[PDB]
Each structure stands twice: as C-alpha cells, then as structure tokens.
Design a protein around this nucleic acid. Structure first.
Ligand SMILES: CC[C@H]1OC(=O)[C@@H](C)C(=O)[C@H](C)[C@@H](O[C@@H]2O[C@H](C)C[C@H](N(C)C)[C@H]2O)[C@](C)(OC)C[C@@H](C)C(=O)[C@H](C)[C@H]2N(CCCCn3cnc(-c4cccnc4)c3)C(=O)O[C@]12C
Lengths: 49, 82
RNA sequence: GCCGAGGUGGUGGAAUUGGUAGACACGCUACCUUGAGGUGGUAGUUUACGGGUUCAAGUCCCGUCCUCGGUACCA
RNA sequence: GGGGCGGUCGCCUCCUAAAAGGUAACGGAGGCGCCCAAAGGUUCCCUCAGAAUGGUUGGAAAUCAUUCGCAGAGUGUAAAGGCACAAGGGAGCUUGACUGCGAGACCUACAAGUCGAGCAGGGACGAAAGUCGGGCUUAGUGAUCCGGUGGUUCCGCAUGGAAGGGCCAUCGCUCAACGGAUAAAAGCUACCCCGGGGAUAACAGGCUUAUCUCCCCCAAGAGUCCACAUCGACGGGGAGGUUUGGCACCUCGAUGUCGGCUCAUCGCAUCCUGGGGCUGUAGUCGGUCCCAAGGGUUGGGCUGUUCGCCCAUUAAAGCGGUACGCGAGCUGGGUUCAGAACGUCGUGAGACAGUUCGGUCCCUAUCCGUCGCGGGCGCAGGAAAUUUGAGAGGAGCUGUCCUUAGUACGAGAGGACCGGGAUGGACGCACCGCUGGUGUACCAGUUGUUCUGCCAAGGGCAUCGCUGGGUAGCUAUGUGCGGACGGGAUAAGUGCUGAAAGCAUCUAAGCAUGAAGCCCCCCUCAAGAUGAGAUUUCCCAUUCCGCAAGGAAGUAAGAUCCCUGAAAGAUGAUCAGGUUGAUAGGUCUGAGGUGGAAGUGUGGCGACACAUGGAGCUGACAGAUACUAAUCGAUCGAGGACUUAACC
RNA sequence: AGGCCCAGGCGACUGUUUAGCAAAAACACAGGUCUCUGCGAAGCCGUAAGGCGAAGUAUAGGGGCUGACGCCUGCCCGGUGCUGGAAGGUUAAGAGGAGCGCUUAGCGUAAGCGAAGGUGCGAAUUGAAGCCCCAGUAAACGGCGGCCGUAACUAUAACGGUCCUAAGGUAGCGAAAUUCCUUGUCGGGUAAGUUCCGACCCGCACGAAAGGCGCAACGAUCUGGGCACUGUCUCAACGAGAGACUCGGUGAAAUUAUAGUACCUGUGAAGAUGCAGGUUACCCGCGACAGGACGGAAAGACCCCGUGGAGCUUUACUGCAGCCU
RNA sequence: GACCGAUAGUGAACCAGUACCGUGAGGGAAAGGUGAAAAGCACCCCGGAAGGGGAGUGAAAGAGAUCCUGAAACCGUGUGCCUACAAGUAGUCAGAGCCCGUUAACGGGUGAUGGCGUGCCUUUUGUAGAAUGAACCGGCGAGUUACGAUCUCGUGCAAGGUUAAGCAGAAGAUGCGGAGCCGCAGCGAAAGCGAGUCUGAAUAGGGCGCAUGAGUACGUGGUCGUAGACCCGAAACCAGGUGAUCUACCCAUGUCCAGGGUGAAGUUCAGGUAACACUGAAUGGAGGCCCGAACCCACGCACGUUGAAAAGUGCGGGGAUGAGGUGUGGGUAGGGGUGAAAUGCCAAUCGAACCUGGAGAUAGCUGGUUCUCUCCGAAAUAGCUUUAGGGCUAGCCUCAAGGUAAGAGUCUUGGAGGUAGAGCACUGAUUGGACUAGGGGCCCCUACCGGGUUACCGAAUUCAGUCAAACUCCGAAUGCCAAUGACUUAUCCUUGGGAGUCAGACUGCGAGUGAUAAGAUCCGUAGUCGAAAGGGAAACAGCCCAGACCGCCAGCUAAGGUCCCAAAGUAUACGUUAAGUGGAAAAGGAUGUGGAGUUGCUUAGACAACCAGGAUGUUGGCUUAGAAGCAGCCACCAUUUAAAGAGUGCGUAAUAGCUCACUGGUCGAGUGACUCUGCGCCGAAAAUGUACCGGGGCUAAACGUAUCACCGAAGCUGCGGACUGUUCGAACAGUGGUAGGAGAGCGUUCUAAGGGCUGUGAAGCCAGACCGGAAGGACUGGUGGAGCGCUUAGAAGUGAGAAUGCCGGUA
C-alpha cells in the first residue's frame, strides 16, 4: 500500500510541475451577438405616397 | 484489523491571550501601567483610570487601585493617590 | 454505512451565470402526398426536488431524494 | 497510538480548562489571508425586535400610525466578551485612517506582539469643555538576504564629479511545509549495503475483553389449551482468555513462520462409554439438564492447507491449553530472497489491487531436565539370603451375536430393560513350539575368469557373484494371556425417620442406597523410607603399641582381583563356573538343515543317469567325555560407642 | 547394457545460462519483418591519429522486434516519435548604432545649459537549425466505448435510434502460466477428484509480430491418469560393513560473569535455576534423548529511523559528452 | 633532551622490509639480558639417547645455553580444619567444635548450624534480568597540544600597561628594540559633535553614555573557536596504479572423440513410357540423427554441513562429429572489458575488482572513557527547528562576587475570576394535562363556495415537571493577586563562570480520547520512583511508614502486627457469622440468621391439622352433537344458609368425575404479612500441581465496636567518634544521591635545588595477625643483586574491569 501510495503522489507532483511549465490558457471565445428582431405585427398594405 | 477513517477537522485553536487582572486591590501602581486586560468592558474605568483602544484599563496617575462596583451589577477600577 | 460519479422532453444527450417544453439528432401529434402504409414535405409539445444569491440560476451556494461504481458484514 | 493513505502545518474566538493566568491529544465547534473615503473623526440629535388590533392589490411576513415592549434586535465579518449615559441608529461639518515621540505597563526564550497618560508641531468638529495617532474589542498575515521607486546640511578609494553605497519613506514572497535549508529538484530497489532501535510494527507472552465462545436473569409469546418438555423475542447480568481486535510492557548485539510426522500431556464447557432427574418419555429411538476427564476417540479422494465437502467405517470420529505444544526432533508443499512468465497498473525503472514454474533447514550436549546403568559411603560389628511395604508407576476402552423373549409395550407396524453365555476390534504383556521373516563361518546348483602342474576334485573374485532352501538367536503379520470378580467411601439422584414450623419436608440430629469416577483388589519398581526397616542363619570378640581414648595388622565368616564364559551385556553390572569340574573349545554320539558327497563300478558316443548310499557336509542346537584352557597367587574383609529401662 | 503407455500447458528442435540455491516456460536459434547505410557507408572504440565494420559494397553490413512449420496477422496517424514539406509566426550570439546617461572646454551675475572627445548603456533592422504549422508512417511508441428501444413474450435482439471517440477488439481463442467471484456450471475419469480432461461463456483484467491459433518430432521442462513394480507405506523385523561403545597411542574446536546450577504455583522489564511460599532431592560418574538454559553461530536480512549510501529510471532539478545549426 | 626503554622508541635494539601472505601492485610480523671472565659443568653414576644426581668452576649452578628479576592466569604435591539428608550470586552477620600462636590485639585458619541476601557494566520509566559486554589473567588502550577568545584567581605596574620581529647573548636568563596593540570618551550608518551625542523643528521627550573612573602584561585554572580535537566504527566517494595463470568472449596454432545402430541426396541395375515422370532392388554414406565408454556438464536423491573438500563424494542423469572438449601462445581493465543476458563473469571479491593515497572521510548513531573523599544537587517541561532519539534560548542545578533582608508560611483584611453545586431568568433539549387558529379525513350539496362532524394531527398561549462542556437569574470550598500589621523560619533578587536535561513511570484526585476498557493515551494537581537505602504489603522502583556520616550485643515508637514458621496477647469486654465466609465476581433467586419499625389475625377463640357441607333462582345458553365457567363469551348477578364463585385448581377429544373456594363444629395460643439494615447462601468454568490466606493451620488464630500492654525501621533518643556550615576551643544545625557544579587530597614517571640510604644488600618480587576518614603509606621476614627513596616546587605519554577492544599466555 505504501508502494502504491508513493506513486500516487509522484504522478501528482509530475502533473503540477508540467502544468506550471505549460501555462496554456483556455482559448477565449469568438464574439457573437444573437441580437435578432421580431416585428411580427399584423399590418395593412399601403404606407407611403 | 485497521479500518481507515480520518479527518478530525478540529485541530486548531488560537493563542491564549492573558485577559484579566494584572494588578490587584490595594496595590501601589505607577502611571501608565495596565490594570486590567479584557475584551468588551467586563469592568469599567472609574477615577484616574482610562480605557484603552483595546479596552484595557490602565492607570493615569500613581496611586493605589480599588475595584469598587458600579451600583447594580457592574464593576469599576479606580486609582486613588496617597 | 463511507468515498467517487450523474440525475433534462418518450430516447440519447451538448449548454464558460445572459433566455430553451426546449437550442441539436430521433421519436410523438395534426395535415399533405399515396389505394392504404414507409420514405418525403408543412405546423406543433418547467433542467431530480425545495429554499436562497443575483437585475438576471440548468449553471453560483445550502439541504433532501434516486441510480451507477469502489469500500463491509454475511453466505 | 508503527510506517504509508486520509488529515494537518500560520493567525483569531468559544468549550476541554479543574471560579487568577497558563495548560495537551489525529479532543468538540467554528472562522481568517478581508471590507469601508464612510462602515473613520467630531458635533448635534434618538432608540430597538416582536405581539395585539385598524387597515386594497399586500400574502404568513414589506411600509404606516397606534399601546405593551431596559432587550430577542442591531453591532461590516466566525465566536466569545461587551453595549440603550450607546459601542446600536440618523444628519451637518470633516480627514487625527496626523508628524516627532512617549513616563510606565501587560505579554514573551528570542524575534516579536499589545496598551499607553502626556509633550511639542500642525489641524478636524465644537460656543466652550473637550474628543480625535482609524473602525466595538480581539483575526485579515510573514523575518532576513537581494533587487525597484521617492527623498535626503551622509559617504564617495589622490582632487572635482560620477559609478556605487548609507539613511529615511516604501514596493516585489499563498517563501501556505507560514522562524521562511537552494534562485532552482520527482521515483524504483526483490540486486541491495551500512549505522541504530524492541525509543517502533507483525509472530508468541502480558494488560483489556468492544468482538468471539459459553452461561444466566426477566418473561411477552410459540408449543391444540398451558411462559418455563423443547424454544424464547424486546431488554439485562456475567464468566472464559481459543477468535478478530485495542495498547506497545519483554525480545531487532535474531525469541524460525503455516500445514504435516514423531511424541505427548492437561482443562472439562462430555463426542462415546457409566450413573441419573424432566418430558409434550407407550416400545425402539429421543430432547434437555445434573454428576463424572478412567479409557477410547478411524481410514481414504481433492487441496500446501488447518478448514471444508465427499466415499466408507465407528460406540464415538469432542472442543480448547501447552511459544495457534513440539524444526539445538524431522519434513519444507505453502507463503515473503535472488531467475522467469501471464493478466493488470505505470512514460519508466518496476509493482500488485493477481496467478504460475524453480529455488543451501547449520551445531561433536557443559549444566539442568528425562530414560537407563555403574562406582563410593551411610544404615553403631562384619557377612549370606528371604523380605514387609511408606511411596511410585502401569492397567483401566468396547463391539456384535445368542438366551431371557417376539416376553413387557403397542391397535398395529414395530419391539425392550434388567439377568446370563459365546465370540470379536483396537491396545498391552510375554514367547517362538505352530505359520511366516532374517539368518554374510550351514547345505546345494550354476556363469565368467583366475589359481591349486594336468583330468577329476576344489579355492579366489565378481552385492553373501547370483539363485533354491535354512539351524540357533532376534522377531509378527503367529501363538498364549489380560483389562475379570468384587469390597469401602462417595457424586448426581432416589429415599426412610423427622422436627424446627400441631402439618408438610431426603433436615439441624439419626440412618441407607447409589457411577466406567475416588481408595483398595490386579501388574511392576520400591528401606538412600538418612524415618536407612523385619526375619532366618554364619563368624566370633585375636596381636602389638601407648599410660588411656584411639591408632595399625594379621585374620574369621564372606567377597574380590585374574581366568572359562552366556541365559546377561555399550562399559561397568547380573548370572553360570574356576580342577571334589561339564564354565566354554575340541571329541564322540544325536536333533535339525541341505539333499544324494568324493572315490569306484556300470550304462550311454557324449552332455549325464544309476548303484555303493536318507549319502556326505553341518555356525551359534543337547547329551555324554577331564582331551585343551579356567594354574600358582594376591588383595579386601569382624573385634563391635554411650545413656536409660527391663530382665535374670 | 531402455521401464512403458495415455492425455495436456509452455517452448519447434540440437544448443546456452545465474562458477558456489534458480537449467527453466528464460536466452540463443533457422525463419519473418521494419528501419539505417553510395562506401572516408551507417553504427562502434578512441580527444585525435588510427582502426573494426571490411581487402566487405544494398543478394552487403549495423540496429529494433518476433521466433521452425501450417492458416493468418483486423481497426485507429487524434497524442508521442520518426520521415517529408516550409510560404508564414517566433527564435540566439554575431552584425548595426537611432538615441540616453556620465565627464567636460565654453557660455551663463545665479539657476542651469553645454560642442568635440573618452566612456557606460543601448532601440529599430538583419540573423539559421529547432519549435508552432501542413502531410505520411502502426511487424513505430501506443490505443481499440457507452446507453436506449424493438419478434407468436420466456427470454434475447437479426434491427433501429442517439451521444462520445482517432477508432471503438475483427478472425481465432477463452475459468487459460491470463477468471477475483470460485471448489463457476455441465460431462468424463475416481468409492470419493479444490488438481486434471472436454464443453459452455457475464473474458474481475485474451487477442493477432510484448504476435493469435494450431502443431509431427524433441524437452534431467511443468501437469493429470494407468500397466509393471516395489519396506514409499499399513507395521515393522533381521543380517553385513563404516562410526558410535571398551582398551593402548595421539588429541583439537565453537563456547565460556562466578557458579555448591531441583519443580510447582506465584511475583517480577508482564515467559525464573538463581526471587517468594511450599514440595521433593545421599555423594561421583558412564551410555543415551534433546524440553529449558528466551541455547551457540551471524551488532535482524522483515519494520521504522538517519536531513546514511549505492545501482536503476524518467516529461524531477541542474549540468556534461555527442549530434544538428 | 623535565625524548623512549623492548606491547615503549623506527616497521625493524636481534642477519627486517626479513619470515610469512598475494598472480600482482602491495600488506607485513614475532624475536634483547649466563657470567666480571667461558672459568661454558674434566670425572663418577642411572639412561640407547634426552634428562638427571653427585663432584668441580663460580660470589651465587636455585647462573648451565628462550640463561638477570621472574608476578598473575593455568597446572601439580603434601598436609591443619570441613565435607557422601542436602538445593542457596556462594557472601556477610551470629556461631560451637577443632588446629595454630602474630607487626600482641577486644588474635589467626577453618568452619557444623541460624537470620539475611537474585554479580559487575552499559542503556533504561523500570534490569537479577530470559536486554547488552567480557572465558581467565597480564601489558597496552580515551577529553591532549598549538594559536586565539573570554571569566575567575594570582603578581607587577597602574590612567598607562606592554613590546613583537630582530641584534647581542652557553638552543638560556637578561640588555636593547615601543613599530605595534589594549585602555583612558562616548555617541552617530556617516559627515561630524564631544561629557555628551543621535533622532528630532524643538530650549522637549527618549536611546546609548559618564557624573558612582581600572585597565593592562603575564601565570594557574574553567569553557569556547580553528585544527583529526575524546577514543574506537561505517557502508561509501575520489586519484594513480596492479590484475584475463580463475572465469567471459575472441585471435593464431595443434590435439581428442571405444564401439553399436538408423539409413538422406546421389549412383547403378531391372521394370515402365513417345520421352519423361514413377515403381522396385542394390550401392552410397548424409546427420547442430539415435543408444552408449573416454571427456565435458551438473538434475534428482542421500550423506557430509567446526566436511576428505571455503561447492565435494556415492548412486543414478544430459551432450558425447559440431553452436563440441581441450592444450599452448596471445588480446580486451574498472565511470572499463566481456556477456547464446544471469547485473552473470573479470584470480575462493562484483548493482561496478584489488592495492595504495586523499584519510584519523563523515557519523546529530552505538559502544567505551581508568584514583579517592566532602559540600550542593537536577531534568525528562515551554517555545522554535526539513524538527520529532538531535540542537538553541528560557525554566530547574552549582560556584563566586554583590545587593543585602527583599523571600516563605499562617492569621486578619481587600479584591479579580463564574467551576462543583443549584436554577430555568436567556439559549438549546424535553413529559403530561387544559384550551387552541389551523392541516387533514367522513361527507352534504356544490361557483373547493357554504359548511356539518369526529376524542385524527396540531403551529402559538398557560399551569405543572425535567435536563445541559460549549445555558446562566445565582453561586461555593479552595487556589490566586495584594496590602497591612502580627508573629514564625531563612531564601529570594542581580551580575558573571560551568552545566546537565528536553524518552519519564505509577499511585490518589479533577477532566479529555477510549467502551466514564487497559500496567492505554494525553493534560492539571500532589506524592513517590527516577536519583532512596531501611521496616510493612509472602516475593514486588512506582502503595503505607520513614529519609542511611559512622560504631554499639542500648531504649522508645511509625506503618504493620502478637498460635507456629517469625519479634510480640492463644489479651480483656460486647456482639456477628459457620461459609473455610475470611482467602475472587454480577444481575437475579431463597422459610439462613442477628437487630430496628409498624400493621392484621387476636382465650365471646385465629393458624396448622381432623369432620361435615361441594348449594338456590338455574344442571348456564351459545360457536355447538357438548362445556354444570372448564378450546372461549356475557353478567361480574343474587338468596337457601352458621357458609359457596355460576369460579381460582384437576381432568376428558368437551360435559362427565372431582378439588379448593367459603363458613361451621374438634383442637388449643403466637401467627402472618411488610420495610430498613448487619453478617452470610446460591448464581461460580481452563488449561504442568494443592494454587485467590505466604505456609502450616484456625471457628476465633474471622469480622464489627472498645480498651490496655507489647513487638516493630538505618525513624527518634542515649553514648562515643568524623566532617561541613553558623555564633565567638565550646554551642547550635547538618551529612542518601544519578547527570552535573564545586572543594580537599592519594599515587605514578621525569626535572630542580635540599636532605641521605644502599654490597653490613637498592628497585622489583613473595608473605604477613601494622597504620591512615579514602585514594594509600610503612615495618619485619624471604627471594633478588644494583640502583633508589624523602621534603618543597615543577611538567605530564597520570591511575582501567568492561570498546563482539589489540597483543600475548593459559584454561
Ligand atoms: C552450512 C550451514 C550454514 O547455515 C545456514 O546457512 C543455514 C542452514 C541456516 O539456517 C543458518 C543457521 C542461518 O541462521 C539463520 O539465519 C536467519 C537469518 C535467522 C535464523 N534465526 C535467527 C531465526 C537463523 O537460524 C545462517 C544465517 O546462515 C545463513 C547462520 C549464519 C551464521 C551463516 O550464514 C552460517 C555461517 C552459514 N554459512 C554462511 C554461508 C551460507 C552460504 N552457503 C551455503 N552453502 C555454503 C557452502 C557449501 C559447501 C561448501 N562451502 C560453502 C555456503 C556457512 O558457511 O555455514 C552456515 C552455518
């Protein structure tokens, strides 16, 4: 159990050291708006003369 | 057999701070000397005793110390001269 | 009992607090086409729960319930 | 409370904390690594939460008045302490969230940390008094070193500068393992090595007994009725120290581990056998309980296995202690050494949360202890025999079949206690006549080669050359025997008489039965039984010293040295003998064993057969026999203390 | 001067191997394949000369892997390696020198400015390989999924849906040297078989060159059965020789505080010969036996500790040789 | 020469870098003494010699060739005393008997017998330890030196102390040499200023100073620092060499392989065809082919396992013509070679050879660390620590100088603090009743609208009760802080030198963790041990008593005891128990007894026992063929009667048959429930053996109450010594001790001035019945045969019982 639990910490120290050397951030997302519209009113025919 | 449960969660404790009487009744006491370390005002300042910023009761003048009472149920330090 | 994981529509399931009964693929319903089915075309149905935080909650937080698995009594 | 894992590492508050202060544990709870330009300062104001009513949409509960509410509210934030003269709420004005300090204190190993009246300079608010060096107190943070920034009547390697340094103010550290080893760091080791510890783990011992095993109380209920035939819930009380554990007290200058083998012994909580009481015990069989540890308690298949299941017996195939008895007694299959492989994990060396094949079990016994055998002396003379028994050891088990008797019982099916008899199993003791074994100086056959000069007859060697028999001795698988009959006292139990207590009662008195158990009977050892015993019998009380006690020195009866030896034996010992003698060897007769000797003759060409001829040979066997050796010797070995009593 | 037969696992075999615990299923092997290398080859030894390779020349020579033979060797190039490309981004030192300090003649009544020079620093620009990027390669390193519904119901799913992935384990094999559950279940062998054999297949946790499946022969290999055979055992007995034992000669050694060295129960550093209370025991040897002297031996090999060591590993840290540029 | 003297000093006093050991590099000993001189034993005897006894020589022959002296271990001979029914850490104390007759004194050797008694060392909380170390004896073997720092003590000079190198001088002292160093003046980072000075704006405040002034040069001593720094000990690392005579592979070059089988390719012949294929004979001789000797290798067993042998023997086993065995010559060398790969092999070494150097690596770890007495005497704790078995500071100990009577106890008095207890007034928990908005459920209709009910739950109110470490309206006993006086004892404070200790244990109490288990763990508190002997608890660190300077053949006591082991009461008085309770344990069970308290029956008459009653309404009706209760309901009813339930027992498959109930007669006075408590009973089992009194054994020799004696310690007292401290020869007080601090000495070797004793016999050695408080010191006698003590100083290679120490001798 001690032999397995010494590996279980060695791999975590390797993990944290490679993550401090890596420092590769998640990529910031591109920009979207979604924005859209409705204007769904029942409307007549004639507007501008 | 040794089955594992851990995690006490309650190890820590703060350092003992020495509240309470530092000088006694009828004690000769110089100026500026701390008469009572407390939190809150368990005991009030009376004559010639000031309450500090950490509400310790200290003596403003030289003289003996008296712990009288503030009447109903309440105490008081007062320093008198000789 | 303890630890770790997930609880969405009939289904499998994405969603870094910012609009989802559902946005995505199926089912499902009503119609059309066809002799009648199938395919195809048109339209349609509160996030396990309860209480907050917030202008805004599936998400952030505190508790309850369920299911997967590891870890036990026993056969 | 071994190490790893988990958890923690610094600071604050409460409880532990034992009415000062302090105080630990991997004790119980919580928080912190900040926030606020007002949530600071001052001045002036003023009082909270809830409840009961009146009130739209307003809801149980917003806001309103209204009474009652010295306190739950509020206090930026955990928790404690504190607060309504506000520290809690408003509004104005403000920057003291100042600079240089600081008498004196608390705290503390240090480093640090906390409080501080007052002084001066400049202010804020206030009419003034005054208050203000942050907040309601305690958390909200880290040394130094090295660098940055700002400022300075500081220094500046000859001089003037400068580079650079100092000082002051300050910034960069989750250096979070928070008094911070570096600016910078993860693993394998079964290929391993060293220095230490029983300061520290496992085994076994010890304390404990939660757990385990066992026992019991209460009694609801089950048991057709009926708690107590047998069961016994919910709960309760204990014993034991065999389980899994707790703790680390002995051992790390070594306390070898499981299973098996050999050998046991002990406890009784009894598996069989013995005796019993209760029954929901008709009988055979049973169930439970009490007494009893005397004896016994199997052989196989698989597994390393203990365990377990199975097969087939048994009267039964008991549970536990002894370092899970027993490795200076044995085995080494399993597990945990080095090789190697599979599955799986790891990037990896390697590892196991697994499996598989192979793998050095050392020691001449000093003491105690066991089992045997001797040698000395004792035992008030010296000797030879036979002994009593204190004491001690052994043995102590039991089947089946028949008779009683198909009787008792039962409706039947089924089927007895008790009382007799035979024959067994295991075990034990003896012995070899029988059956067998072994028999290496017995007898025979035969091969190879070699020797006796040759044929014939023999010898050597080849495991005793091999092979077929085999005497004595030793021996079991063979034979003979035994554990039987009984007393006496009991245990459980069953009772008589019988009160205390006009009765009842196995009771205190008085008596009696009653078990494989206890003491005997049976077998062995046994007077070192220093408590040294008792019988019957032999020898007798001599010689010098010396003045005695006493010494020594010839003996008696008796024994030994030495010798022939076996019925005995490691050696001693025992025993049979030592010339008036069969103790051994030889001899000669025999038994037994082997089997038809050699020579000769005949028959056959010959291998060979047959006769002479139950022949010849013959180790340990037994009966005669003085043939040979037990020769002559020599040594040791009594002279019997004292007192008293009794006798004559 | 052979024991033999029946079946199985692994390895084709003959060989080799831990001298002194492991002889093997481990190495090696013929075979297969991948890759390097145009010959001053590649790789290797050496700082270099000089060599090996090799007086060899791709049918040759190094290196990895797998191991005769038979049938075969599936999917994934997303990650890591190689291999190729390289337009572009980055990227060193060296180059370049815009400028800013510092000093200073001089100008300035002060304050300050200040040429040239020296000197300290230094921006833009250029600057390879590598890396980022784009493709190929799995007999390279490696990896090879879930869930839901659906058939005369009693069950499963040929089928369909949908997430996820780089792809979701194909053939063949499967309680195996791999199966924890476990002594799976069924069948055989056996009176009885946790092992064995043949099946099944919910494969904890097989699987195709860490090769998959078979396979005649071979094997001081491992495993199960059987014939013959036997003191291996029921259950021991006897005989022979060498020691042991007695006598004559010779004569060590480990060990060892001094020892006139009992056994119960107890106590005690918790397991006494030595202590306590009892119980027993004349003095001295000889052959035996090994229960104790926590016996002898080896300053525990297990466990922890030491801010001990040493071999190994890697995407631990920091370096170095080599190799590109 | 204040160096060595044969285990020392070179490794080597001697034919020594020798003998040995290794292939090699390299490692590396042991071992001195006749005499003044050979005068080294002519001669005789035993003896084969060896070796002797005489005789000679000699001063000595005990001086005779490993030879001066010649210890101890060890081994022998003779005898004085003891010893063959007694277990004895081996002694000591008592003690007869015997045998002697000394350094002549409360002699000496032995000791039957009695009481007591589990070695030394180290490490430990604790060791007889079944933990370690040593077989014994002997020698050797560990805190030293240099330079520097500081403190005490000493001396000189002192606000001035003093030179170093050097020169001269017998390896000297001394003279010269003041260059230098430390001080006299501090403060500040520095400029600087100066009895002041920095900070500061400050004439302020504070820090550090001096006004209350001693240093300096040497010397002894303590300690620290740098050196191997107190001895011994690693595994390891590095540098340069030496090794393929073993073994791995390779290179050149030879050589070995008895015999027997199987029988490939090919070839030939015959058949066969169109020719081939093909078939069959023969021939041939292949083969990491087979069986099997030599040889090689090692798998199985048994033996050996202080071996025949540091890897073998015996019996079997594999290969045994090719990846073969093997000889000879040769090559590769350590961070390297070699490897059909095991990290295997590289000279009986291998996860990195051996040797020599760095090197006396380092070791926070283990072991040891040697003479004595006296005064005093700890700690096992806090904080911090890559720290946890280590270290530093503080606490605790010691010495000195100081200040000096501050300390300490108790009484009186004043305070702070909120536990134990208690209480509910907060905060939580929580039992029941009363009401009680409301939530359901039965529903009625009906716009869930209105309701109608329930003993179905109830938020909030009230009364009454409980409980709390993190609850307090309250609040102790103590402990704590003081002042004040009062007594009563001295021990605090400061400064400096030196430490050690940071593993603690158990018991009583207050808590925690644990299971309100543990000889458990962790704190507070007090004791004891540690570091404490003596007496008791049988034995027993830690429990109870009490603290050891020493002697005594003296007394009184503590705890514990008084029948015998075994000292003291078979003591007294009054009760209890009878189980061996005492001398082991619970729930629970029980007519065991002793003592207190009430109550009912109660001579117009109980209890026990004897006799007769065993009913009436009504023989009780259903689920039922029954139940006169009786397998179970329904009334718990009511008079015949002095007295009877329609039922508590028994029984049947149920009634049946009965018994008690309940009252009468006979009898003739204690009887029949309950509570408290004292002492007992069962409940009650385990492992070699009585085995839970120590034993015998006890019925008081147990227990309870009470009283008086006595025993009982190293306590106290008496007497007599010794030492230390206090007051000025006496008084008073004291004196266990680990680590450790301090003080006084003893001894060894050498040197120095003195002194003198030794050939009429030095040191050494061997004996003694001598002296001193110890270490130790003489005096005789005997061996020895030439050096050695005493007094005062000095300097140390300074004292051994322990290192699994080294060497030697011997068990
Ligand atoms: C032959 C007997 C050997 O014993 C055993 O090895 C073994 C039987 C043991 O059981 C023995 C008693 C062990 O004790 C045990 O140790 C354990 C670690 C602990 C045990 N207890 C403490 C629990 C303890 O009993 C131990 C440790 O031995 C290892 C004792 C220790 C002192 C020894 O090592 C010991 C000296 C062994 N040895 C070492 C060489 C071994 C290599 N080798 C093998 N063969 C040869 C050989 C052959 C032929 C020729 N040459 C050489 C050489 C020998 O030469 O002989 C030995 C004594």
């Amino acid at each position: 159990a001690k032999r397995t639990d010494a590996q279980i910490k060695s791999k975590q120290k390797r993990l944290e050291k490679e993550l401090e050397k890596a420092k590769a951030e998640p990529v910031t997302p591109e920009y979207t708006v979604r924005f859209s519209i409705d204007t769904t009113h029942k409307t007549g025919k004639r507007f501008l003369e | 057999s040794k089955k594992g449960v851990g995690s006490t969660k309650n190890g820590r404790d703060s350092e003992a701070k020495r509240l309470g009487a530092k000088r006694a009744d009828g004690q000769f006491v110089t100026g500026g000397s701390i008469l009572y370390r407390q939190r809150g005002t368990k005991i009030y300042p009376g004559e010639n005793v000031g309450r500090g910023g950490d509400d310790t009761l200290f003596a403003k003048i030289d003289g003996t110390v008296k712990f009288e009472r503030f009447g109903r149920d309440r105490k008081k330090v007062s320093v008198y001269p000789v």
